[PDB]
Amino acid sequence: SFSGYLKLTDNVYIKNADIVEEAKKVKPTVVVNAANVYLKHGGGVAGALNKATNNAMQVESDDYIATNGPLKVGGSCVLSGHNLAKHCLHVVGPNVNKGEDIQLLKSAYENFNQHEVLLAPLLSAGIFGADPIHSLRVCVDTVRTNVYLAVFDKNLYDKLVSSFL
Numbered sequence: 001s002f003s004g005y006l007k008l009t010d011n012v013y014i015k016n017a018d019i020v021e022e023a024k025k026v027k028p029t030v031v032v033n034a035a036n037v038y039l040k041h042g043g044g045v046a047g048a049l050n051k052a053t054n055n056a057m058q059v060e061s062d063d064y065i066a067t068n069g070p071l072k073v074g075g076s077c078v079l080s081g082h083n084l085a086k087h088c089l090h091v092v093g094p095n096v097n098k099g100e101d102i103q104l105l106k107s108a109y110e111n112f113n114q115h116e117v118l119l120a121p122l123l124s125a126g127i128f129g130a131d132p133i134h135s136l137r138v139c140v141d142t143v144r145t146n147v148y149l150a151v152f153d154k155n156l157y158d159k160l161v162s163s164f165l
């Protein structure tokens with residue numbers, strides 16, 4: 001099971017960890033991907049998770065988009081977790097660097113409530129351009145299921161813990 005996490009609330013936990021290495025160790029039921037609407041897993045968490053699957057995540061994702069079309073910003077889909085997890089929940093938070101509505105971040109986190117326990121990154125943070133302190137706040141005030149947050153950047157992790165209300 002999950003180990004070394006700091007408890008933030010009744011149901012939100014956090015750790016300074018690479019989510020790929022955490023997923024390989026834990027093999028959780030659900031790993032969350034910080035996806036875009038096209039499921040094009042180029043960089044950030046998505047590029048790292050896809051590379052760890054030897055591109056099998058991207059091949060599966062291209063078939064999903066060919067059948068269903070793009071996701072909505074704020075939406076999600078459940079696909080295989082490949083060698084990392086049973087399932088991957090691909091969730092699209094708004095990308096501030098592409099000019100998307102930050103109010104859609106709450107809708108993005110609501111997708112987590114469909115799963116009893118998840119390993120996840122902070123949505124819309126990193127290369128998606130939103131303030132990670134805000135993302136953590138929306139996570140705590142939205143998700144009611146058990147979420148284990150993996151924060152890869154050590155300096156960000158320390159800032160998120162020290163500023164957490």
Ligand SMILES: O=C(O)[C@@H]1CCC[C@@H]1c1ccc2ocnc2c1
Nearest residue numbers: 018019048121125126151152153
């Ligand atoms: O936690 C971070 O440092 C940022 C915040 C938004 C997500 C990003 C991240 C998370 C896990 C990652 O695992 C490999 N690369 C990763 C990047």
